[PDB]
Amino acid sequence: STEYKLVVVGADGVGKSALTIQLIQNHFVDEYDPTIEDSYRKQVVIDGETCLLDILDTAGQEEYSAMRDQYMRTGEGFLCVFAINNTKSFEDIHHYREQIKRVKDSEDVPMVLVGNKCDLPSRTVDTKQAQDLARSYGIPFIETSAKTRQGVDDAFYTLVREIRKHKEKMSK
Ligand SMILES: Nc1nc2c(ncn2[C@@H]2O[C@H](COP(=O)(O)OP(=O)(O)NP(=O)(O)O)[C@@H](O)[C@H]2O)c(=O)[nH]1
Ligand SMILES: NC[C@@H]1COc2cc(Cl)ccc2O1
Ligand SMILES: [Mg+2]
Ligand SMILES: [Mg+2]
């Protein structure tokens, strides 16, 4: 029983909620109901550990940056979601990461870059662009589809492995 606080961040409409609901409830939400904030728990076994995941599913846009600051201080790792057909959402990852680092006063923050909607026929953000940026940041990159469930579990479980690695580091 280790608890892990995961926050799912990203621009409007990239699939934050569809990903999270696939993880928690195992179905795909076809509808677009914009999020205020939602909280979910999931117990899972990852590499033999019993993990309690406390997941925050965030809004695409806040009216209040104090709300953004708060989740950024609370989360232990961040699922940084863009959509592969949304350039601006990819670009926004830079901004999220800079804010998170500021708010935490730290260069070392557990994160996973997620390129969602990989089921779509055309992408405007290429996998190589995204892989190269993740390499730069020293974080994993995973392509996902909440529609088909491709990559959903591996995205969240990878973020847990990154938070474990971080705690291991902050010890030594
Ligand atoms: N084809 C496809 N559509 C998807 C995928 N994920 C989400 N969608 C669709 O994209 C729309 C937005 O999804 P949603 O999960 O609500 O996005 P969000 O990032 O949570 N929006 P918000 O920022 O307002 O909370 C919905 O119509 C949803 O079904 C995906 O992987 N593939
Ligand atoms: N309701 C949002 C606040 C701030 O951020 C949170 C982050 C997590 Cl993982 C859980 C609950 C949280 O509470
Ligand atoms: Mg949402
Ligand atoms: Mg957002």
Residue numbers in the entry: 1 to 172
Paper passage:
High-resolution crystal structures show the binding of this compound to mutant RAS, and this structural information facilitates hit to lead development. Although, various RAS inhibitors have been described in literature,24–32,47,48, in this paper we describe an approach for the development of RAS-effector inhibitors by combining different elements i.e. (i) the hit identification via a method of intracellular antibody fragment competition; (ii) structure-based design via crystal structures (KRASQ61HGPPNHP) and NMR (waterLOGSY and CPMG); (iii) identification of clear structure-activity relationship (SAR) for the development of potent compounds against KRAS and (iv) the proof of concept in mechanistic and phenotypic cell assays.
Protein crystallography was used to determine the KRAS-binding site for Abd-2 and for the truncated analogue Abd-3. Two different mutant KRAS-GppNHp proteins, G12D and Q61H were crystallised, and the crystals were soaked with compounds to yield high-resolution structures. In contrast, Abd-3 has a rather different binding geometry in the KRASG12D crystal structure (crystal form II), as it is stabilized by two H-bonds via the ligand terminal NH3+, one with E37 carboxylate and the other with the main chain carbonyl oxygen of D119 from a neighbouring protein in the KRASG12D crystal lattice. Thus, both interactions stabilize the terminal –CH2NH3+ functionality in a different orientation from the one observed for KRASQ61H, but it is directly influenced by the packing in crystal form II.
